[PDB]
A paper describes a structure:
On the other hand, the removal of the C-terminal region (aa.216–277) of [name] ([name]ΔC) that does not belong to the LRR motif affected little to the complex formation of [name] and [name], suggesting that the LRR-region is sufficient for the [name]/[name] interaction. We prepared the [name]/[name] complex by combinatorial usage of the purified fragments that contains the elements necessary and sufficient for the [name]/[name] interaction and successfully obtained the crystals of the [name]ΔC/[name]_LIM5C and [name]/[name]_LIM45C complexes. The complex structures of [name]ΔC/[name]_LIM5C with one crystal form at 1.65 Å resolution and [name]/[name]_LIM45C with two different crystal forms at 2.2 Å and 3.15 Å resolution respectively were determined by the molecular replacement method. Consistently, the deletion of C-cap results in the disruption of LRR9 in the [name]ΔC/[name]_LIM5C complex. In all three complex structures that we solved, the LIM5C fragment in [name] and the LRRs in [name] showed the essentially same conformation with the overall RMSD of ~0.3 Å. These polar and hydrophobic interactions are interlaced with each other to provide the complementary binding required for the highly specific recognition between [name] and [name]. Interestingly, although separately distributed at the interface, the polar interactions are well organized together by forming a hydrogen-bond network. In this network, two buried water molecules, conserved in both the [name]ΔC/[name]_LIM5C and [name]/[name]_LIM45C complex structures, critically coordinate three clusters of the polar interactions as highlighted in Figure 3D. Interestingly, the very C-terminal sequence (aa.308–325) in [name] is indispensable for the binding of [name] to [name], as the LIM5 domain alone without this C-terminal sequence lost the [name]-binding ability.
[name] ([name]), a leucine-rich repeat (LRR)-containing protein conserved from human to worms, was recognized as a major FA component and is important for FA formation and cell motility. Among the IAC components, tripartite integrin-linked kinase ([name]) associates with another two key players [name] and Parvin to form the [name]/[name]/Parvin (IPP) complex, which acts as an essential platform to recruit many proteins for the FA formation and signaling and provide a linkage between FA and actin cytoskeleton. Here, we solved the crystal structures of the [name]/[name] complex and found that [name] strongly binds to [name] through a large concave surface on its LRR solenoid. These results indicated that [name], by interacting with [name] and preventing [name] from binding to actin, modulates actin dynamics at the FA and thereby regulates the stress fiber formation and cell adhesion dynamics.
Author numbering:
A (entry chain B): 249 to 318
B (entry chain A): 3 to 208
The structure:
């Protein structure tokens, strides 16, 4: 009975579970560029949203430094 | 592919999603034919060089997902709130210290990301909390000192992210958010909370 964090519908297919949330397989995607992701892709957690590696590299240095020290 | 070709392909194959992330775009009006794509439901313009969004955004009337993450946007048009179908709006990592008149008029908005801007409680439009369809509101990395009690009107909120603001207190009305599952409040200046919020972990205050 998991509801997709993105489309807000009951997930009919397989459930992608990550970051204490659930997504449809075809909804799970980078929160900052919307590129489709799977749990086999490299991504980071940012306020409990997935951010792909390529996007995270573009974050401001001051923020990356704070998130690392944390 | 060129931006010209991406617009042409979208129109010809009636593709609802347009991906123009990281394409060096400095002005949406200079993306040839972009605003003629009335059918599209997703437009991704993350990681570009935008400083403004033109009123023509209203012409993309079927947008459900609109992503401006990591641009340099300083101002939005009032037309941004005309998007009747818009469910996801990412304005993270821009230069916003203001939102336009009537921003709260978006009737379907479910996820609003305003992370990493220059916003405070004074930046919110008078009708901001008419956005009662919101499920997730991201305000982290901003300059809020107070959060208005009107936050309690967002009764469908599941996620409220307030990390790394300047909050000195939290409104009791957060306790009214029966669906709330995530509350990010690390990095603020919180000391003691209203009893209605109960025992929230106040670890990691600055
Ligand atoms: Zn879904
Ligand atoms: Zn990404």
């Amino acid at each position: 009975g998991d509801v997709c964090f993105h489309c807000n519908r009951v997930i009919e297919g397989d459930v992608v579970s990550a970051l204490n949330k659930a997504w449809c397989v075809n909804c799970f995607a980078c929160s900052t560029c919307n590129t489709k992701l799977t749990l086999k892709n490299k991504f980071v957690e940012f306020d409990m949203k997935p951010v792909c590696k390529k996007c995270y590299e573009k974050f401001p240095l001051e923020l990356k430094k704070r998130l690392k020290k944390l | 592919k060129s931006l010209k070709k991406l617009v042409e392909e979208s129109r010809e194959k009636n593709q609802p999603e347009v991906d123009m992330s990281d394409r060096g775009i400095s002005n949406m009006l200079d993306v040839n034919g972009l605003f003629t794509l009335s059918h599209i439901t997703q437009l991704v313009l993350s990681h570009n060089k935008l400083t403004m969004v033109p009123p023509n955004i209203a012409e993309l009337k079927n947008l459900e997902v609109l992503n401006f993450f990591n641009n340099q946007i300083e101002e939005l048009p009032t037309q941004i709130s005309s998007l009747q179908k818009l469910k996801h709006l990412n304005l993270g990592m821009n230069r916003l210290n203001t939102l336009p008149r009537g921003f709260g008029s978006l009737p379907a908005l479910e996820v609003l990301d305003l992370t990493y801007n220059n916003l405070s409680e004074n930046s919110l439009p008078g009708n901001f909390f008419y956005l009662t369809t919101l499920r997730a509101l991201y305000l982290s990395d901003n300059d809020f000192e107070i959060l208005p009690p009107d936050i309690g009107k967002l009764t469908k909120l599941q996620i409220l992210s307030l990390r790394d603001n300047d909050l000195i207190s939290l409104p009791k009305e957060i306790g009214e958010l029966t669906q709330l599952k995530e509350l990010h409040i690390q990095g603020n200046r919180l000391t003691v909370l209203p009893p209605e919020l109960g025992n929230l972990d106040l670890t990691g205050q600055k």
